[PDB]
A paper describes a structure:
The crystal structure of Ls-AChBP in complex with gAusIA and rAusIA were solved at 2.60 Å and 2.46 Å, respectively, using molecular replacement. The asymmetric unit contained one turbine-like pentamer and only one binding pocket was occupied by either gAusIA or rAusIA, possibly influenced by crystal packing. The C-loop was displaced outward by 10.3 ± 0.34 Å in the occupied binding interface, which is comparable to previous co-crystal structures of bound α-conotoxins (based on the measurement between Cys187 Cα atom in the complex with HEPES/Ls-AChBP structure), while the C-loops of other binding interfaces remained in a closed conformation. In this orientation, the first disulfide bond (CysI-CysIII for gAusIA and CysII-CysIII for rAusIA) packs against the C-loop vicinal disulfide bond with the central helix (residue 6–14) of both AusIA isomers protruding into the binding site in both complexes, forming an interacting core with the binding interface. While the electron density for both disulfide bonds of gAusIA is apparent, well-defined electron density is only presented for the CysII-CysIII disulfide bond of rAusIA. Despite this overlap, the second disulfide bond of rAusIA undergoes larger conformational fluctuations compared to gAusIA, as suggested from the ambiguous electron density of the second disulfide bond in rAusIA. Despite this difference in rigidity, the extent and nature of the pair-wise interactions contributed by gAusIA and rAusIA are similar. Similarly Arg5 in rAusIA also shows a degree of structural flexibility and no well-defined secondary structural units, allowing it to bind in a similar manner to the globular fold, explaining their equipotency. Meanwhile, rAusIA contacts are closer to Leu109, Gln115 and Leu119 compared to gAusIA, allowing stronger hydrophobic interactions that might be expected to compensate for the loss of the water-mediated hydrogen bonding.
AusIA is a relatively rare α5/5-conotoxin isolated from the venom of Conus australis. Classical α-conotoxins are characterised by a CICII-Xm-CIII-Xn-CIV framework forming three possible disulfide connectivities: globular (I–III, II–IV), ribbon (I–IV, II–III) and bead (I–II, III–IV). α-Conotoxin AusIA is equipotent in the native globular and ribbon conformations in contrast to most other α-conotoxins where the globular isomer is more potent. In this paper, we present the co-crystal structure of gAusIA and rAusIA with Ls-AChBP that allowed us to understand the structural determinants underlying the equipotency at α7 nAChRs of two conformations.
Residue numbers in the entry:
A (entry chain G): 2 to 15
B (entry chain A), C (entry chain E): 1 to 205
D (entry chain B): 1 to 43, 46 to 205
E (entry chain D): 1 to 43, 45 to 125, 127 to 157, 159 to 204
F (entry chain C): 1 to 66, 69 to 157, 160 to 205
The structure:
């Protein structure tokens, strides 16, 4: 995933 | 459409005070807590202060737009959207939001809101110095929407729990489990769905 | 009617600053406290901090809707409603509301508001370690509406008050009584109705 | 008229940012403190809770009550309220109660908030028989004597009718007396009520 | 004109978000601190102070003819431009203790004197004869010297307003004007540095 | 144009809730911390409380005008501001100063609030010569790199640092970090600011 980064996690819910 | 147009259309159609139910099915809301830190543990007067990202997702078709020639997501202030009325039933302080109060909205109407929250809970701290540690239970569900209106589900996302946690804390995370429950109180004849999050942690050493 | 229509109609018809009296009868308000926790007892200062759900109901028939194929209840922000100006006459801190500020309106015009509130009171805590324990007295009624305008009544003891109480508190509830009264002061020609809540509690050990 | 009509008419005529002076006479404001509790004495600050009974008139609010209700509750954001301050306070007043006043059909307004506030006072003798005294000065922050007069109501030593039985302290005496102060900051005189709360620790 | 008319006209012409510069001259702002109390001294080098911040300036847009009319009115600060003063070395947000009303004079003079509680970093000698000194630096946050000038007023009894029940006493209060240029920012920023020399009784 | 006209024109055309992207380029935001104080280092809990000026700049060409004034002060509620957060903060940022930004006639916006904030940071060697280092990670809370890019500005020297602190600044360095994940074609950016500091003696 890209789950660790807040922005990425917003753009790609993990 | 440009971002201005999307945002303009969202203000026209979005009803922040109206749960976006579809054909009188519940709005399916998912909640996932990512723990960032544990501060001010108190072995007397039970009590812990935690910082966590509250990942909250749901869908609201009233927000949707055609993204064929347009951006596929935008950031929108939460005051322009319906947001679920989530509360930690066992919190002893108001949630303090640390981060900009913006949600991410996808062109299909998926919404992600993930505030960083500092909050104090009543929790069992006996054993925080031992190997098996202490466990703090946080119960989160809708304050006013029972199970025909809002369903609440944990996300599948299992053991990666230390990645988000401050490496400089005095404490370490042993385990986090997120389990669905459905509670009826005598105050209120319907059932309210919640996620119970169990944070198993201990002092380092 | 859909939720959107009802919420829209509530904003049009509801007068948040106008007590919904009918034919110069008092608005009957029922108030009942469910204790969730007792925190920060202070044997020095005789003060205690409590968390309680304040179950509050009353009616405003102007809000009713009788239409077919409609919800039985909606969730509405309290700023769209008249709410009774309830206060704990003997509180020593401002009530801190922990929960989303939404009330339920039922299709018959009943309004149900149950905020979680944290608040500090002056009470005699000397015997908190003894068998018979300490008692905290909380008086709740309307701040500005005397008995011709607002009546205040407890609801009848259905549950044990311990149903809602945190098992992780340092304290346990021995007894809760909620009794109707009337207060008068020399400030004021009329009597004010209240509920007097006696919270009898003690330390677990 | 029903309550809705009265409240509607009050919003039409009421000017919350305009002192309701009549023909350039001062608005007579009466103020009285009723002590509810004394909370956190510190060897030199003390914390008090008091109901601030405040009345004045605003004839613009008046209505005909011959076949109508005589009094209503109104949010203070719809009313002019006096800009009262405790000149010697060391904390912001914390208002504990709903911010609603009573308006009477003749234009009398009654506002009685419960306030928690900290003051600087000499508490050394709080454990002695004669006790400690806390002095609170209350008047208008910006309105001098030609614009606002401030007067205590009659009954001075103030019976602890309102005082918590569960306080660690007891009230020996309360006196509430009128004064008129000029500071060098400001060329006009400001009226105040000086409240002396004489209290001591219980045995 | 009655007070209602004046207040109404002030709302019509007053631009709370627009500095009332007149001919591209600075708005001259004067500041004077009157100390009421010193609380919660900490050995962390922090002190908590209460002070009346006497602030004055002119905004000719607010002026009216005082024929019949009042010479002054009380106006909520949300209806006025107010200087964006900050204590550059404060470590807490200023807590305003008093009603947020300013006095406007018919000539356009504005007088705003909030009571403020605020915490500062300063060197706490507090038990010695010569005492400790707390420096409070006050100036415009965003307006350099061509837009806002900041000046002390000429002094009169530093202890006049001071609580006699405080644990501390005021030895002296002094003012210095400063004009500072940082490398962040090519213009000069004016401040007034107020030195509160105090000690434990 | 006078200041009133400029401010009026900004409110038309400024969209506080819309990122002012130009032709699908990111809004280039530069962020730089100037440390003013270090307040409550805690060796027990690994937490530090700091005060810093957060120098933040970016452009919004829609605001531009113009011989007649070149800059104005504008309340931030009239502007889009980047949704920057310190990812490792453990308290809400407390803004100490008036919430006004500077807008330049070319559309540059400069916002520099004074902020008090607590971070989780390694304080172990704060009494040693080489000292402790506190890392503060800053980026957009909801925007990836094609919408908002974040870069440090070029100046590091404690020009702004209180001489009355218990601590002294040894060094401040700023590095940009930029990751692309295989899930996702766009890049994620933050600025890591390293505050190397120690107790004086």
């Amino acid at each position: 995933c890209c789950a660790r980064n807040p922005a990425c996690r917003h753009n790609h819910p993990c | 459409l440009d971002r201005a147009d999307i945002l303009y259309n969202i203000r026209q159609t979005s009803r922040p005070d109206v749960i976006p139910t579809q054909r009188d099915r519940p709005v399916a809301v998912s909640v996932s807590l990512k723990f960032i830190n544990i501060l001010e543990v108190n072995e007397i007067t039970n009590e812990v202060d935690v910082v966590f990202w509250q990942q909250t997702t749901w869908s609201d078709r009233t927000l949707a737009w055609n993204s064929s020639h347009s951006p596929d997501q935008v950031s929108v202030p939460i005051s322009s959207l319906w947001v679920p009325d989530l509360a930690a039933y066992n919190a002893i302080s108001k949630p303090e939001v640390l981060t900009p109060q913006l949600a991410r909205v996808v062109s299909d109407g998926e919404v992600l809101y993930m505030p960083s929250i500092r909050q104090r809970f009543s929790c069992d701290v006996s054993g925080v110095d031992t190997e098996s540690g202490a466990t703090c239970r946080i119960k989160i569900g809708s304050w006013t929407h029972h199970s025909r209106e809002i369903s609440v589900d944990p996300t599948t996302e299992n053991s990666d729990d230390s990645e988000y946690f401050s490496q400089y804390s005095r404490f370490e995370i042993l385990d986090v489990t997120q389990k669905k429950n459905s509670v009826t109180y005598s105050c209120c004849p319907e059932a309210y769905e919640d996620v119970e999050v169990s944070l198993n942690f201990r002092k380092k050493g």
